[PDB]
Short mmCIF file of C-alpha atoms and ligand atoms in Angstrom, two decimals:
data_model
loop_
_atom_site.label_atom_id
_atom_site.label_comp_id
_atom_site.label_asym_id
_atom_site.label_seq_id
_atom_site.Cartn_x
_atom_site.Cartn_y
_atom_site.Cartn_z
CA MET A 65 25.10 -82.35 -22.24
CA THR A 66 24.44 -84.15 -25.49
CA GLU A 67 23.44 -82.17 -28.58
CA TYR A 68 20.94 -83.68 -31.07
CA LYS A 69 20.70 -82.13 -34.56
CA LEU A 70 17.18 -82.72 -35.85
CA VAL A 71 15.85 -81.74 -39.30
CA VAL A 72 12.17 -81.45 -40.29
CA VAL A 73 11.39 -82.11 -43.97
CA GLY A 74 8.35 -82.62 -46.17
CA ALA A 75 6.08 -80.95 -48.71
CA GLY A 76 4.93 -77.34 -48.52
CA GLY A 77 2.12 -76.71 -46.08
CA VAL A 78 2.16 -80.02 -44.18
CA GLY A 79 2.90 -78.27 -40.85
CA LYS A 80 6.68 -78.54 -40.34
CA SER A 81 6.90 -75.06 -38.85
CA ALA A 82 3.78 -75.40 -36.76
CA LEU A 83 5.09 -78.67 -35.31
CA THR A 84 8.47 -77.21 -34.41
CA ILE A 85 6.99 -74.00 -32.96
CA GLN A 86 4.50 -76.01 -30.88
CA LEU A 87 7.34 -78.11 -29.47
CA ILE A 88 9.71 -75.21 -28.74
CA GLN A 89 7.34 -72.29 -28.03
CA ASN A 90 4.09 -73.96 -26.91
CA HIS A 91 1.64 -72.23 -29.23
CA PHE A 92 -0.07 -72.96 -32.57
CA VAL A 93 0.75 -70.90 -35.67
CA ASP A 94 -2.57 -70.53 -37.51
CA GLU A 95 -1.29 -68.49 -40.48
CA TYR A 96 0.76 -69.88 -43.37
CA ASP A 97 4.11 -68.11 -43.93
CA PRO A 98 6.35 -70.29 -46.15
CA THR A 99 9.78 -71.03 -44.65
CA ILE A 100 13.19 -70.62 -46.25
CA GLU A 101 15.40 -72.11 -43.52
CA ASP A 102 14.96 -71.49 -39.77
CA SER A 103 16.72 -72.91 -36.70
CA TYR A 104 15.55 -73.43 -33.11
CA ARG A 105 17.54 -74.56 -30.08
CA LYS A 106 16.31 -75.63 -26.68
CA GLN A 107 17.46 -77.61 -23.66
CA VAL A 108 15.11 -80.40 -22.61
CA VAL A 109 15.34 -83.48 -20.38
CA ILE A 110 14.59 -86.70 -22.34
CA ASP A 111 14.41 -90.02 -20.59
CA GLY A 112 16.55 -88.59 -17.80
CA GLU A 113 19.31 -86.64 -19.56
CA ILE A 114 19.72 -82.99 -20.41
CA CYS A 115 19.56 -82.77 -24.21
CA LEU A 116 20.26 -79.72 -26.38
CA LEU A 117 17.92 -79.98 -29.37
CA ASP A 118 19.01 -78.07 -32.44
CA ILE A 119 16.10 -78.19 -34.91
CA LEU A 120 16.34 -77.15 -38.55
CA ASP A 121 12.94 -76.19 -40.02
CA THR A 122 13.30 -76.53 -43.80
CA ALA A 123 11.39 -75.28 -46.86
CA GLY A 124 8.81 -77.50 -48.48
CA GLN A 125 8.00 -75.03 -51.28
CA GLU A 126 10.35 -75.68 -54.15
CA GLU A 127 10.70 -71.86 -54.75
CA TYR A 128 12.17 -71.45 -51.26
CA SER A 129 14.05 -74.76 -51.22
CA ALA A 130 17.37 -73.63 -52.69
CA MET A 131 20.40 -74.87 -50.73
CA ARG A 132 18.25 -77.09 -48.48
CA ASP A 133 20.81 -79.89 -49.07
CA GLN A 134 23.79 -78.02 -47.59
CA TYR A 135 21.98 -76.95 -44.44
CA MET A 136 20.70 -80.53 -43.88
CA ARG A 137 24.19 -82.05 -44.04
CA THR A 138 24.94 -82.05 -40.34
CA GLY A 139 21.48 -83.47 -39.51
CA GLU A 140 21.63 -86.51 -37.24
CA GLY A 141 17.93 -87.43 -37.54
CA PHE A 142 15.01 -86.43 -39.72
CA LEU A 143 11.28 -85.96 -39.21
CA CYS A 144 9.64 -86.80 -42.60
CA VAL A 145 6.27 -85.08 -42.41
CA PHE A 146 3.14 -85.41 -44.54
CA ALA A 147 -0.44 -84.24 -43.84
CA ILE A 148 -3.21 -86.84 -43.41
CA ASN A 149 -5.52 -84.68 -45.56
CA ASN A 150 -3.00 -84.37 -48.44
CA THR A 151 -2.47 -87.57 -50.39
CA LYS A 152 0.16 -85.93 -52.63
CA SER A 153 2.28 -85.02 -49.58
CA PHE A 154 2.30 -88.71 -48.61
CA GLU A 155 3.14 -89.80 -52.15
CA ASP A 156 6.02 -87.19 -52.06
CA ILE A 157 7.67 -88.79 -48.96
CA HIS A 158 10.09 -90.89 -51.10
CA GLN A 159 11.59 -87.72 -52.61
CA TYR A 160 12.59 -86.66 -49.10
CA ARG A 161 13.90 -90.04 -48.11
CA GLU A 162 16.09 -90.02 -51.26
CA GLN A 163 17.37 -86.52 -50.51
CA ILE A 164 18.30 -87.57 -46.96
CA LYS A 165 20.15 -90.63 -48.23
CA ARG A 166 22.06 -88.38 -50.67
CA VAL A 167 22.96 -85.68 -48.09
CA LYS A 168 24.10 -88.24 -45.51
CA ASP A 169 25.51 -90.74 -48.03
CA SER A 170 23.92 -93.52 -45.99
CA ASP A 171 21.09 -96.08 -46.12
CA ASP A 172 20.78 -96.16 -42.32
CA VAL A 173 19.74 -92.68 -41.12
CA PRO A 174 17.62 -92.08 -37.99
CA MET A 175 14.11 -91.02 -39.13
CA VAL A 176 10.47 -90.92 -38.05
CA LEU A 177 7.47 -90.75 -40.43
CA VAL A 178 4.97 -88.16 -39.18
CA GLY A 179 1.32 -87.88 -40.27
CA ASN A 180 0.35 -84.36 -39.22
CA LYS A 181 -2.97 -82.53 -38.99
CA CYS A 182 -4.64 -85.52 -37.25
CA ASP A 183 -7.20 -83.11 -35.76
CA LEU A 184 -8.70 -82.64 -39.26
CA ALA A 185 -11.56 -84.78 -40.46
CA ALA A 186 -10.86 -84.85 -44.24
CA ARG A 187 -8.50 -87.78 -43.94
CA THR A 188 -7.29 -89.27 -47.21
CA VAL A 189 -4.24 -91.14 -45.80
CA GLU A 190 -5.32 -93.93 -43.44
CA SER A 191 -3.08 -94.80 -40.54
CA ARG A 192 -2.49 -98.32 -41.94
CA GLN A 193 -1.20 -97.03 -45.29
CA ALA A 194 1.43 -94.88 -43.48
CA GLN A 195 2.35 -97.73 -41.11
CA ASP A 196 3.08 -99.86 -44.17
CA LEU A 197 5.37 -97.22 -45.62
CA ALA A 198 7.20 -96.73 -42.33
CA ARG A 199 7.62 -100.53 -41.95
CA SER A 200 9.29 -100.69 -45.39
CA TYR A 201 11.78 -98.05 -44.24
CA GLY A 202 12.33 -99.69 -40.83
CA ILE A 203 11.14 -96.57 -38.95
CA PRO A 204 8.33 -95.54 -36.62
CA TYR A 205 5.07 -93.90 -37.75
CA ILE A 206 3.53 -91.30 -35.41
CA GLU A 207 0.47 -89.09 -35.94
CA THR A 208 0.51 -85.51 -34.74
CA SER A 209 -1.50 -82.34 -34.50
CA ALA A 210 0.41 -79.10 -34.20
CA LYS A 211 -2.98 -77.53 -33.36
CA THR A 212 -3.90 -79.66 -30.33
CA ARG A 213 -0.34 -80.81 -29.45
CA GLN A 214 -1.30 -84.45 -29.83
CA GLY A 215 1.78 -86.55 -30.55
CA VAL A 216 4.13 -83.56 -30.94
CA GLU A 217 6.52 -84.39 -28.08
CA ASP A 218 6.21 -88.08 -28.94
CA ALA A 219 7.35 -87.47 -32.55
CA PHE A 220 10.40 -85.38 -31.66
CA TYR A 221 11.35 -87.66 -28.66
CA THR A 222 10.93 -90.81 -30.71
CA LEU A 223 13.35 -89.20 -33.20
CA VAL A 224 16.00 -88.12 -30.58
CA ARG A 225 15.81 -91.78 -29.36
CA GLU A 226 15.94 -93.60 -32.80
CA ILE A 227 19.25 -91.66 -32.95
CA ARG A 228 20.27 -93.31 -29.68
CA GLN A 229 19.79 -96.76 -31.28
CA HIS A 230 22.10 -96.18 -34.22
N1 LIG B 496 -5.62 -78.05 -38.41
C1 LIG B 496 -4.28 -78.04 -38.52
N2 LIG B 496 -3.65 -77.12 -39.24
C2 LIG B 496 -2.30 -77.24 -39.21
C3 LIG B 496 -1.55 -78.17 -38.52
N3 LIG B 496 -0.19 -77.98 -38.75
C4 LIG B 496 -0.15 -76.94 -39.54
N4 LIG B 496 -1.39 -76.44 -39.86
C5 LIG B 496 -1.68 -75.29 -40.70
O1 LIG B 496 -1.20 -75.52 -42.01
C6 LIG B 496 -0.64 -74.31 -42.56
C7 LIG B 496 0.80 -74.57 -42.94
O2 LIG B 496 1.56 -74.83 -41.77
P1 LIG B 496 3.12 -74.60 -41.74
O3 LIG B 496 3.58 -75.09 -40.44
O4 LIG B 496 3.43 -73.22 -42.18
O5 LIG B 496 3.59 -75.60 -42.92
P2 LIG B 496 5.07 -75.86 -43.45
O6 LIG B 496 5.17 -77.31 -43.69
O7 LIG B 496 6.04 -75.31 -42.45
N5 LIG B 496 5.17 -75.02 -44.85
P3 LIG B 496 6.52 -74.57 -45.70
O8 LIG B 496 7.13 -75.84 -46.23
O9 LIG B 496 6.10 -73.68 -46.85
O10 LIG B 496 7.42 -73.84 -44.71
C8 LIG B 496 -0.85 -73.22 -41.50
O11 LIG B 496 -2.05 -72.50 -41.81
C9 LIG B 496 -1.00 -74.02 -40.21
O12 LIG B 496 -1.81 -73.39 -39.23
C10 LIG B 496 -2.22 -79.16 -37.76
O13 LIG B 496 -1.71 -80.09 -37.10
N6 LIG B 496 -3.61 -79.02 -37.80
CA1 LIG B 497 -1.99 -68.86 -32.98
MG1 LIG B 498 7.48 -73.83 -42.71
MG1 LIG B 499 26.15 -87.43 -50.77
MG1 LIG B 500 -7.79 -94.37 -50.03
#
């Protein structure tokens, strides 16, 4: 079976861990425990083939973000996550895109832009603004909620499959 190495990046608190845990373990993490670097692995059938997903859940807090670059190196595709109620996290997305380009030494890396926390009503990033950013990068934009599960499989499966196009 084919192995896909996925990496989830973005600012502190945007819901990287909650997204990954919802996908892999089918529950919502309500509390906020900042991540250093965690890994998850699971076999799943995507569009008709058994896939081993290896998912690296990275730190968004700068204090916990030491050595993030080395662990990301083997990443084949990246989820770049912001929260729709956190304008700064959206403005921060370029930092992550630049880091990915530097770790992979490439301008053509499989990626998906994810607007998380779409269940929340205090939206400050409109869908259209994020679509425009994604278009500039040549990548999909998908909204998610780790709380309700909306879009969660779609985000990770879009990623696994952008990889199949490269
Ligand atoms: N309402 C709502 N809350 C969410 C969602 N995703 C995450 N949260 C909440 O936001 C907080 C931070 O989530 P977490 O997944 O830890 O964020 P992170 O991006 O992994 N943080 P770090 O970079 O420090 O590891 C938690 O309280 C979590 O419940 C979501 O889709 N909706
Ligand atoms: Ca819970
Ligand atoms: Mg985390
Ligand atoms: Mg490099
Ligand atoms: Mg505005």
